[PDB]
Design a protein around this nucleic acid. Structure first.
Lengths: 79, 212, 122, 81, 131, 156
RNA sequence: AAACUGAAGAGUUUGAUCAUGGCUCAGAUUGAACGCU
RNA sequence: GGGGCAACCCUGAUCCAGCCAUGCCGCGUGUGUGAAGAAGGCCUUUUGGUUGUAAAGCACUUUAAGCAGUGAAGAAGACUCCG
RNA sequence: GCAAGCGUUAAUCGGAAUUACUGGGCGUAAAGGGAGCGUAGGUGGCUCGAUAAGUCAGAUGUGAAAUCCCCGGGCUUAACCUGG
């Protein structure tokens, strides 16, 4: 399986969370990395994590049209 | 294709003997030209440039070895592909050709006569490790080390071969080639070295010409 | 041009358009001579250069030059047109292939026959 | 089913065959699951006309692929040789 | 503001060498001291000493060399500037002047020479070329 | 054993009140062929006299160079004014790859294998001067070892 | 063992110069067409 | 590859064949010897030069093309008899 | 000079460091925004730790075959085919 850790941008959706993932990609010609952020939607069964929390998700069978990830664990809480 | 025009005019343009004609008499007495370039104009102003010199050198080597530009370009490409000096490799290939080796052995008095004689399949080349002789009609075949050369039974008593052998003896036999006259058998044990080959020919110019 | 600037905007090569649009990226093109006339060259030169206004199968109405000495072209003659600008003729960007379809080759050409569609004399 | 078969390469009037494991439906020159051997109809005595991988062939036989008759005969000849 | 430190040290050395200064001093850091130690071991500078001053500061002083009137450091150029970092593998480290120079490489085993890193089979940040 | 080569011939005009005046300027590179090479510029009303003046200048403007068997020790990049010349050692048998102005001076030097490139201006005089400066700048591994106070083996 | 081999410029703005700057040629190439053969 | 227990049938896939110099490669259109340097063409200071060993003469050689033969290999052994 | 070919034309890259990451410039040749402020974003002082994401190294799987390259083999040579 694949595990990704990211901030949860939005928790408004019921039984759902949106996580932002930061990754570094090297530009082919120029060769300098650029920060890239892509939103990924995950399924939270108890809505444990509020917005701004850092969460780890793994790939899973599509629960819904836009969600293929699940909230296995929550590591850190926003102050 | 092979050049069909006057042999001497090529050597006159180059300004030095190309070996096209067998040296039965001195080259100077035979033709009494090549002191000046051919044609009506002869001596002329506006001396040639370095690119012209490179072109002249390439034309010299091609004319000496009776090899067209297309084959010469393939040979130069193979030389650059091969390890070591490109000019040395190209000269080695031009030596390796069958017509040249038979001419050095003396079966043919001249390189053109050797090329025709080989194309006619009188000469048989045995590759290393082969117990049966095979007739070849391509004079451009490269020779591997230790290859053996035989005259066919029909061609054993050729008059031109016999007349060519003693001219070859007067000219001298190269060390790498081993020739048995009685059996008319020639072995290519090693390829000619650059030091062995004529110093006057300049390999570098041919390499310069193909580099744009 | 810093690295960040190059990454953000980048480098751009504008592309040269063809100098022979009427050929539509083709070696030659067939047309019909809608006019056969003569014209004056530019300032340094003086002559009566033979030109034909031709409508090609590609739909353009372009002007082509008739090379060589003498020609049989006239109205409603089908000709073949290749590229090649005439330096001293403004607006003439094509050449008429001699001997291709109806443009006869030069009568007594001897040296550059293949450039003018003249058969080998026997 | 999966059939081991010869694939025709080489040059005109000079056939060279490549023994390949491929689906029966797919064409002779099409995709093949695996390559196990080369077969050369016309070859010198010193040269090895037939080369094959016994372990892979046995593996496919156990798996259930159905070898073609020509390949089976070539395998028999290789085994006896 | 000053967004580079290694480049500042390199240009300080270069300007001092062009001005024929006996020694060049600068604010000290462990990375600057390591680079100076590598230069000393390569023989481009005579010595490099860190004097601990007050207020938790330190001064790195490098004694420069001159051979036959000319500077020992023929050229010293920053490669991995802050704006564009360059990281290379073991077989991709650039050679300086056919190997007669030095490409300073900061590897996981410390800051060391390109030839030494090639011997160790290691790579890292190619920080500067000194010859 | 001195070899003289004429890089180029140029014609220049000087204007007096009465009428135009024509003069010839020549550039020649002359060298030993092993370690010593010079370039000279001569001006004369007559071409051969300009050639001779250029030779005389080149002889005094000889400098020494050091070479490994037949090739350059290391890549050399030089700028004289606008023009930029780049030189790269090549293996034996490659030959001299150069655009005339570089070729003349390299052949005077005696280098048999080299790769050259030019950037910006292609002017022959500037190219020659930049090449000459690059040859002067070049140094050998032993000289570098003495510079750094280390043995030849220690430094690669 | 080998795969690690590769870099040319020139004509043209000026009475002449250097730079800059465009335009043009020298090469390879092609499912190629047209002209002589 | 499809169907059939097999015999065998289908297969414009496939293997080949006809046309095209359309690209690449190879080969041939001959090879030696040949002077008051024939004749003619061209240039010329009108007499020399050049075409030019080029040619004629002379002695060979027959790859390719054409004729007469000869003759592999692509074939995996079917079926049938016997253990 | 090429040679069963030879040129012209059409197209692509090269030469063109003439879009310059390798590898260009901005006082006068084209080019510093009229000046400040500041959003996103880019970069960023010294010392002691945790972390190992970027970075480097090694292991595995994969990155189909052909084609490119190297060394051998077969076609009389070559193209061509072909094992590794």
């Amino acid at each position: 399986a694949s595990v990704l850790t990211g901030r949860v941008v939005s928790d408004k959706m019921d039984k759902s969370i949106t996580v932002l993932i930061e990754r570094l990609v090297r530009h082919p010609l120029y060769g300098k990395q650029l920060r890239r952020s892509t939103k990924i939607k995950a399924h939270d069964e108890n809505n444990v994590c509020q917005q701004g929390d850092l969460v780890r998700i793994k790939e899973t069978r599509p629960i819904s049209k836009t969600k293929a990830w699940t909230l296995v664990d929550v590591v850190e809480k926003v102050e | 294709a092979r050049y069909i025009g006057p042999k001497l005019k090529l050597s006159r343009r180059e300004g030095t003997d190309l070996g096209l004609k067998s040296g039965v008499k001195p080259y100077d007495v035979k033709t009494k030209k090549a002191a000046r370039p051919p044609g009506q104009h002869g001596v002329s102003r506006n001396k040639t440039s370095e690119y012209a010199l490179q072109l002249r050198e390439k034309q010299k080597v091609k004319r000496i070895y009776g090899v067209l530009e297309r084959q010469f370009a393939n040979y130069y490409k193979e030389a650059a592909r091969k390890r070591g000096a490109t000019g040395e490799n190209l000269l080695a290939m031009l030596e390796s050709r069958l017509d040249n080796v038979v001419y050095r052995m003396g079966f043919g008095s001249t390189r053109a006569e050797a090329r025709q004689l080989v194309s006619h399949r009188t000469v048989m080349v045995k590759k290393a490790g082969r117990d049966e002789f095979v007739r070849v009609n391509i004079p451009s075949i490269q020779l591997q080390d230790g290859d053996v050369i035989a005259i066919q039974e029909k061609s054993r008593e050729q008059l031109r071969i016999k007349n060519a052998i003693e001219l070859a003896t007067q000219r001298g036999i190269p060390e790498w080639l081993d020739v048995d006259h009685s059996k008319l058998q020639g072995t290519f044990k090693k390829a000619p070295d650059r030091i062995d080959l004529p110093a006057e020919i300049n390999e570098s110019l041919i390499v310069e010409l193909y580099s744009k | 041009a810093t690295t960040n600037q190059l990454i953000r905007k980048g480098r751009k090569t504008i592309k040269e358009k063809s100098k022979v649009p009427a050929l539509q990226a083709c070696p030659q093109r067939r047309g019909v001579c809608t006019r056969v006339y003569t014209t004056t060259p530019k300032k340094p030169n003086s002559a009566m250069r033979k030109v034909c206004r031709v409508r090609l199968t590609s739909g353009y109405e372009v002007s082509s030059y008739i090379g060589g000495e003498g020609h049989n072209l006239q109205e409603h003659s089908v000709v073949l047109i290749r590229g090649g600008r005439v330096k001293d003729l403004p607006g003439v960007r094509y050449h008429t292939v001699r001997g291709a379809l109806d443009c006869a080759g030069v009568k007594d050409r001897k040296q550059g026959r293949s450039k003018y569609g003249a058969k080998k004399p026997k | 089913m999966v059939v081991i078969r010869l694939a025709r390469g080489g040059a005109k009037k000079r056939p060279f065959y490549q023994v390949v494991v491929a689906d029966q439906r797919r064409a002779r020159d099409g995709r093949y699951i695996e390559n196990i051997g080369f077969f050369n109809p016309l070859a010198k005595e010193s040269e090895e006309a037939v080369r094959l991988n016994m372990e892979a062939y046995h593996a496919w036989i156990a798996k259930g692929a159905q070898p073609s008759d020509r390949v089976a005969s070539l395998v028999r000849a290789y085994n006896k040789a | 503001s000053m967004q580079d430190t290694v480049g500042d040290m390199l240009t300080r050395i270069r300007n001092a060498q062009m001005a024929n200064k006996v020694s060049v001093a600068m604010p000290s850091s462990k990375l600057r001291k390591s680079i100076a130690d590598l230069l000393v071991s390569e023989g481009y500078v005579a010595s490099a000493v860190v004097n601990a001053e007050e207020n938790n500061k330190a001064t790195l002083s490098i004694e420069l060399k001159y051979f036959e009137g000319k500077a020992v450091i023929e050229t010293i150029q920053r490669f991995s500037r802050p704006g564009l970092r360059q990281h290379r593998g073991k077989d991709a480290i650039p050679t300086v002047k056919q190997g007669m120079g030095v490409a300073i490489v900061s590897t996981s085993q410390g800051i060391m020479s390109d030839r030494a890193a090639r011997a160790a089979g290691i790579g890292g940040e190619v920080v500067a070329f000194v010859a | 054993g001195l070899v003289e080569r004429l890089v180029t011939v140029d014609r220049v005009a000087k204007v007096v009140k009465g009428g135009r005046i024509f003069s010839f300027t020549a550039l020649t590179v002359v060298g030993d062929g092993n370690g010593r090479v010079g370039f000279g510029r001569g001006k004369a009303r007559e071409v051969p006299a300009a050639i001779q003046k250029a030779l005389e200048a080149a002889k005094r403007n000889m400098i020494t160079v050091e070479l490994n068997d037949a090739t350059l020790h290391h890549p050399i990049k030089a700028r004289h004014g606008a023009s930029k010349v780049y030189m790269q050692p090549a293996s034996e048998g490659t030959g001299v790859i150069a655009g005339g102005a570089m070729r003349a001076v390299l052949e005077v030097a005696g280098v048999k294998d080299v790769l050259t490139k030019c950037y910006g201006s292609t002017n022959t005089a500037n190219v020659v001067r930049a090449t000459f400066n690059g040859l002067r700048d070049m140094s050998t591994p032993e000289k570098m070892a003495a510079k750094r106070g280390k043995s030849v083996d220690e430094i690669l």
